[PDB]
Design a protein around this nucleic acid. Sequence first.
RNA 1: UUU
RNA 2: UUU
Lengths: 775, 773
Amino acid sequence: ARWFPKTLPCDVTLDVSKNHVIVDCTDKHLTEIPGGIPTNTTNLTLTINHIPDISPASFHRLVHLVEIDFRCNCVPIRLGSKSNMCPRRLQIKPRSFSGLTYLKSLYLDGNQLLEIPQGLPPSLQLLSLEANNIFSIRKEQLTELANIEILYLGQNCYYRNPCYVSYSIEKDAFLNLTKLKVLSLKDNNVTTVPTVLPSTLTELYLYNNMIAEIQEDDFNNLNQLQILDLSGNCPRCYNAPFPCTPCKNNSPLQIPVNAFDALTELKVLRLHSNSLQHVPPRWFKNINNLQELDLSQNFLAKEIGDAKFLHFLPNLIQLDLSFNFELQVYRASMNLSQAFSSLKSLKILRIRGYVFKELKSFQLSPLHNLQNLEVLDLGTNFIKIANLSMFKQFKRLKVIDLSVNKISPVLEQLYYFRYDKYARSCRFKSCYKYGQTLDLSKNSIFFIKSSDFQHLSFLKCLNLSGNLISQTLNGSEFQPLAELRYLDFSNNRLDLLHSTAFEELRKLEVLDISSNSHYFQSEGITHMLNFTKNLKVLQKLMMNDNDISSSTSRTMESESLRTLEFRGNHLDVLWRDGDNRYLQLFKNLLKLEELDISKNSLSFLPSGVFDGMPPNLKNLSLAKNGLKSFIWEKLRYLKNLETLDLSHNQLTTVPERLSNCSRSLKNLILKNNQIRSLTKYFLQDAFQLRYLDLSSNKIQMIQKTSFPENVLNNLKMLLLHHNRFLCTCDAVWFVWWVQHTEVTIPYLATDVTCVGPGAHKGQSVISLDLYTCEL
Amino acid sequence: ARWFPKTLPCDVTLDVSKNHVIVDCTDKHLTEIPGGIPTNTTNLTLTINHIPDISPASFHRLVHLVEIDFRCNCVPIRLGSKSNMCPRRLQIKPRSFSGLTYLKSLYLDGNQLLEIPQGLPPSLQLLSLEANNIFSIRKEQLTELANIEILYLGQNCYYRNPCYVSYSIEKDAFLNLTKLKVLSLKDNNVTTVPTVLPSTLTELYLYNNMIAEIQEDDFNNLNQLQILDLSGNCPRCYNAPFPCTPCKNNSPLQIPVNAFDALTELKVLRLHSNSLQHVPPRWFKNINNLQELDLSQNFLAKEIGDAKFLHFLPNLIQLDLSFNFELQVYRASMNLSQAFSSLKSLKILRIRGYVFKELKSFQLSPLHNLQNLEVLDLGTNFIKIANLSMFKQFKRLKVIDLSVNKISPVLEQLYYFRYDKYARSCRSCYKYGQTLDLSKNSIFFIKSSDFQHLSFLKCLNLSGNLISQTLNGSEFQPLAELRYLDFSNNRLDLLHSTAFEELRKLEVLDISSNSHYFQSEGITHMLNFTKNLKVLQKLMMNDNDISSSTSRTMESESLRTLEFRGNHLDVLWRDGDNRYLQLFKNLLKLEELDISKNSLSFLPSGVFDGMPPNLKNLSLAKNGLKSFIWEKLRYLKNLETLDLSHNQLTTVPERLSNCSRSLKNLILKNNQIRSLTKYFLQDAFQLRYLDLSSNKIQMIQKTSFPENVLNNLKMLLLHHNRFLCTCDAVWFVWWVQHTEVTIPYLATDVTCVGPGAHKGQSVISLDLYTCEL
RNA sequence: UUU
RNA sequence: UUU
Ligand SMILES: *[C@@H]1O[C@H](CO)[C@@H](O[C@@H]2O[C@H](CO)[C@@H](O)[C@H](O)[C@H]2NC(C)=O)[C@H](O)[C@H]1NC(C)=O
Ligand SMILES: *[C@@H]1O[C@H](CO)[C@@H](O[C@@H]2O[C@H](CO)[C@@H](O)[C@H](O)[C@H]2NC(C)=O)[C@H](O)[C@H]1NC(C)=O
Ligand SMILES: *[C@@H]1O[C@H](CO)[C@@H](O[C@@H]2O[C@H](CO)[C@@H](O)[C@H](O)[C@H]2NC(C)=O)[C@H](O)[C@H]1NC(C)=O
Ligand SMILES: *[C@@H]1O[C@H](CO)[C@@H](O[C@@H]2O[C@H](CO)[C@@H](O)[C@H](O)[C@H]2NC(C)=O)[C@H](O)[C@H]1NC(C)=O
Ligand SMILES: CCCCc1nc2c(N)nc3ccccc3c2n1Cc1ccc(CN)cc1
Ligand SMILES: CCCCc1nc2c(N)nc3ccccc3c2n1Cc1ccc(CN)cc1
Ligand SMILES: *[C@@H]1O[C@H](CO)[C@@H](O)[C@H](O)[C@H]1NC(C)=O
Ligand SMILES: *[C@@H]1O[C@H](CO)[C@@H](O)[C@H](O)[C@H]1NC(C)=O
Ligand SMILES: *[C@@H]1O[C@H](CO)[C@@H](O)[C@H](O)[C@H]1NC(C)=O
Ligand SMILES: *[C@@H]1O[C@H](CO)[C@@H](O)[C@H](O)[C@H]1NC(C)=O
Ligand SMILES: *[C@@H]1O[C@H](CO)[C@@H](O)[C@H](O)[C@H]1NC(C)=O
Ligand SMILES: *[C@@H]1O[C@H](CO)[C@@H](O)[C@H](O)[C@H]1NC(C)=O
Ligand SMILES: *[C@@H]1O[C@H](CO)[C@@H](O)[C@H](O)[C@H]1NC(C)=O
Ligand SMILES: *[C@@H]1O[C@H](CO)[C@@H](O)[C@H](O)[C@H]1NC(C)=O
Ligand SMILES: *[C@@H]1O[C@H](CO)[C@@H](O)[C@H](O)[C@H]1NC(C)=O
Ligand SMILES: *[C@@H]1O[C@H](CO)[C@@H](O)[C@H](O)[C@H]1NC(C)=O
Ligand SMILES: *[C@@H]1O[C@H](CO)[C@@H](O)[C@H](O)[C@H]1NC(C)=O
């Protein structure tokens, strides 16, 4: 169905709305630009390869190029692979880009360049040079960039990519870049704000540098600046997980009180880790539009209790004051200045790492009439004592986060302590939705009783993950929580002695009791797995990693439940050959459509398992079980089966006729097994099949009988990579069909390969010429 | 160095003291008895194969055979592999054993036999027929067994191997077995004690059957009986993890009060899971030598508060009353009858699953004057309250076990609830002194008074509690002699470098799986807490997710072993950050360092220079290591064991001798090595152990493997590679066939992958003469 | 393989 | 592959 097989090792896409032909050669172990890139190419990506040089030949025919992504073909030593270090910085020969009349975006990050590449066409709007070795900027090397709007020069001189000197920027080096909008000089060992900058700037990134002082006029002309980041100059180095050098004498970054006077358009101001001890109100007198203010990682503990500057910020949306605690101090309470009430627009308040023993209702009173407050983050504070009922005055909030505290009656794990949380990689460029959420995860709650939740009926999601609850819930513990839709109870020590546990949460839709294995690990203890009958609107139950190998009740019942995750348990033990008592454990989950019973050590399936399955099972995972055998005919019992996941097992054969096993099956995942061949008529008349993963097996040959083309043409996707294909003349049909087929087959260029015979070993099947079989 | 390669796929062993030549063919995927078993063979094992038949041809020349272990060549359907089911029962042809004049032991278990094999020689002392399909015993089928002493017939009729009828034993079927000592009829659907049995019996196993009544005759003549097991007749089925059928009318196994009168030599009596409600003293009036008594899994909760029968048991060493609780009852306290004080000889007391809210010292007073008491096991009792000081009155005990309770201010994982805890297969801090096991309880806070009056303790087990606390050295102050603290599976907060420093005698410290506070960014951790522990020998901090440390070094003058598995040294040693490259350098006496499973995909230079000077044993396993600068091994001048298993290395050093002149054990299994350097092991004379298994090696020439090195090796592992058995392989194949060196799995997995002709063929069996024409 |  |  194709007259010309595609052999280029890059994904090619056409977006003819925007007249884009996109050629993505990311990470193809290329040592040369591949030949035969389409002449109409507009966006070309060659990131993560080992192409040692660029020359006028590189893009000779590619005159329609709009974007070139040529990053990380020689990344600096400490930043790159220690198994394939780059031997020499990329070589860019003269003329290499001058002919690209339409070039608008050029990425040359991560190539060990020593200088700003010259000869760039005047069409260029974006130039990216992060993670090179360019640490002296001269006006003359920037003349060629007259039309530039976006310029990235960071990560060229810092601990992971050292240049061993101060960064150097000539006076007015950027002044004649009259269109420059975005200037990034982060992570560069800069010692002063370079001046004068063009008044067109909207975004300026100077963070993680060696700037000790702002001159009063450094930002004088930037009346268009919208984002200003000066973080990490005079860092707060306590507990930094990167080499960190503070300013002398615990000095803060010094900022004159009038330094921001011209920035009338400023929306974002980041002063993270600048060792600030005061926030003078004078700073914000001519900025009335500020929306986001990051003041995390300073020494503003006392200032939080005063904080006159908040009065000048009626429009502020986000305020971050996290990690301002004074060293070695465990305050008794949280002193929030009354000035907080002046933050009429405030949506998000974050004060992690204030460090205080006891939170009491009045202490939040400055916040009671902030009408737009949606998120209040008091995590990592070592709070020991908290009357949860105080949040009855915060029913309007979307998320109350008390995660990681010591209480006892979404940002990344590494966030406040990252070096550069906005760093770009070489590759590219949750229950909140249910309503009001009270996150008490990773605290020290060992016992709960119903009064702990008095006045919180409004809650829709409660997160108790990772506490120390080691209790036999009987339905009395959660009684105020009349609207709760989601309880995360994972990583506790639930003792399911009573089948009435959780029954008071009459509106519960999702229950996570995963990783509550403790009491399931000791023999002879009663466990009531039929606690589900009482939850009349429960949709989804997660019981992963509970090590369940025994159950006092023999069936689980639900009229509502649609999804059960039962991964990481011991159904091999409950279904021990000879023991029939648990073969209908899920049969009475009458509405169940999704069942994950992966990772249950099921090396075989006892007969009666499939008969025991509830009648509407659609999506069944048996992955990661060490299944050594499988009676495909037993799928006939599963009359609604659409998705069968058998990946990461030990199967050696597929059914003789998959259609004779299941008339409903649409998605068959067989990846990571031991299959060495397909049955003669494997997919004959399997009209419902849409998705088939045979990758990571040991298949040597595939004949046309196994793969009838009326079936192949219905497949959305057919995965065949990482097998042991034998490219002899017996493979002529398969090699021809792979080369000419419309069916989507991932990794044809990278991982659909001959293992032999010798002559063809390691060769891609897509590129195989078998004319010697037709002489 | 040997003139005739061994080709037999069995380990052959000589014990010339006992004139035994031992031939072990266990699990070699054999479908026939291999040819060429040494003719002098005495012990021959063929367990776990698929030999379909035995015939006179089987052991024709092997007339010196004393033992034949021919088990599990046709396991019953539900007991065996469901991926390789046995299609037809083992076929034993006539004569097959009559000529084995010296045969003393015959194991034919797990072969689906329907009848007792006949024609067995008169020399036979031991016959084993477990897990077959023989469920009717007839006196005439037992004549041939006149000299038999040990006879195993169990597991021929039970839930995993059903026979669908009652077991059948004819009257006096065993009476003429005049030397028979051991009789096992367990797990057999037996309905009555077979009678009459020979008085020569020492051991009788009738457990897990359908025996509802003991007749008073039943044990009348067995005055040499030493062990009697009647457990699992009328089982207590509550929470049984197997199909369990109780006797009707909630009846117990009924035993007349004089049933044991003749058992004067009885040392062991097992009545586990017989649904007993009373233990009549009269049972034990003529047995005063009973040592071991198991009464677990009955309904003896109230009887424990009475227990007159104990007065008749002055010689008893072990007493088990575990899991006798009444269903749905949570007693307030433990009512131990004073009769326990009459158990003068008792060393081991076990009372799990009594189930009571609060333990107070008074309840243990009946035990105060049992001078030999060594073990008191009160685990799985859901105790909420216990003043630990009550055990000041028990300093004599070796182990006090409160494991799995709800306290708050080694037997198998499955033991009391196993079907047959003694079934045959086909194929810890106690030593430190007095141990208090509080593992798997609900302790969330500790303070020094919790251990008042317990200074005598040598090992404290707090594993798996809920301790989420910033220890400063004040918490364990009474425990002045403690040598072993297990603190694993808690939530330790290492804020203070003075944690544990009060345990002045601590030699072993496990703080593994205390990851909680290590997973949250920006929290202070003092990994230098070791400086204060002056006699600490072994420190375990596995699986803590450690990726940050406020202190830059760990200091110890005593520590010899550090386990640091399952952490993030990859973060601490991020390229560019030099701060933690001497984290372990000042552990000056450290000999063993486990830093496997630390995501070390590379090692920053300086890691090796940072190692303490006396490092002997280093594990870098399971790190995803893609590269390794072998030359930096020169810094490790005392290195004896290097574990690099389960990584992604593709090469070995050009000269291992130029990398380490001390290295003795190099473990490289499960990597990506596809060839060896030209002179790999040249002059590596001290090397004793080399594991290259599970790699992709195609060829090995003699330059890489000089014979002056290879023959000094205790063991050399090469299995599961990609050997290409062409004429270029002639040296390697010849040497593998003729070497004295131990190479495991030569019979099963030292294989040619090609060329085609020789694909799948073992190199040990390889003929390469066409290379010498 | 810019974190 | 007798648990
Ligand atoms: C192809 O290249 C063009 C230009 O480099 C990309 O267009 C930019 O897309 C971003 C996405 O937010 C816009 O903000 C810019 O304004 C666009 N710039 C120009 C000059 O058009 C386009 O996204 C690229 N497409 C692909 C698929 O790579
Ligand atoms: C940032 O610049 C400083 C100086 O401005 C560099 O510091 C010098 O480094 C050399 C070589 O390491 C030393 O011999 C000098 O003593 C240092 N001078 C000072 C004043 O500290 C520093 O190396 C640069 N940082 C990076 C990452 O390149
Ligand atoms: C070889 O076979 C003999 C007999 O089958 C084994 O000897 C028995 O070992 C037990 C162990 O205590 C003794 O109680 C028996 O009395 C021995 N039988 C005798 C002496 O006839 C011997 O252990 C076997 N050895 C091996 C390695 O299989
Ligand atoms: C133990 O023996 C009993 C008989 O006492 C067997 O039970 C019989 O089983 C068949 C088939 O299942 C039934 O038709 C009979 O009615 C049963 N008889 C009785 C009295 O219940 C039982 O199967 C045997 N157990 C094993 C494991 O073989
Ligand atoms: C050996 C114990 C098997 C039965 C059992 N299972 C549990 C369990 N999972 N949690 C408990 C928690 C507290 C007290 C008793 C039990 C208990 N118990 C004992 C018990 C169960 C039920 C009752 C009646 N409330 C009293 C006592
Ligand atoms: C963002 C906090 C980093 C420093 C830190 N680390 C810890 C820690 N591991 N545990 C604590 C436990 C209680 C109170 C404070 C801390 C604490 N703290 C704060 C703190 C530490 C020590 C002291 C003096 N006891 C007061 C306050
Ligand atoms: C809070 O701190 C401020 C300044 O640090 C102080 O003026 C104020 O009185 C304090 N208030 C309370 C309630 O502690
Ligand atoms: C918590 O505060 C509520 C009022 O919001 C009150 O009803 C309750 O008594 C308080 N509980 C405790 C333990 O102080
Ligand atoms: C609850 O918190 C844990 C840990 O903080 C987090 O992993 C989990 O995703 C949260 N649960 C929900 C439902 O968002
Ligand atoms: C459930 O637990 C609560 C608190 O322990 C108790 O008041 C109640 O009696 C228990 N039993 C029930 C609700 O049946
Ligand atoms: C749960 O099931 C078991 C028997 O299968 C029984 O012990 C218990 O009464 C049942 N309880 C409920 C609420 O279904
Ligand atoms: C099937 O279930 C898995 C989760 O177990 C999910 O990731 C997958 O998308 C599901 N597919 C369909 C078609 O429901
Ligand atoms: C399988 O095929 C046979 C013969 O074609 C047919 O009789 C039988 O009904 C089929 N079974 C199913 C479930 O399609
Ligand atoms: C402490 O108890 C745990 C769990 O009960 C056990 O695994 C561990 O081996 C014990 N510690 C020692 C040192 O024996
Ligand atoms: C250690 O901490 C405990 C915990 O409360 C405290 O009672 C004690 O004063 C502290 N001791 C020292 C020596 O710091
Ligand atoms: C551990 O190191 C810190 C410095 O990081 C120091 O303050 C503390 O005193 C040290 N403690 C010991 C016992 O060495
Ligand atoms: C080396 O250490 C491992 C544990 O990390 C141990 O199991 C092994 O026996 C040690 N070998 C020697 C010779 O000390």
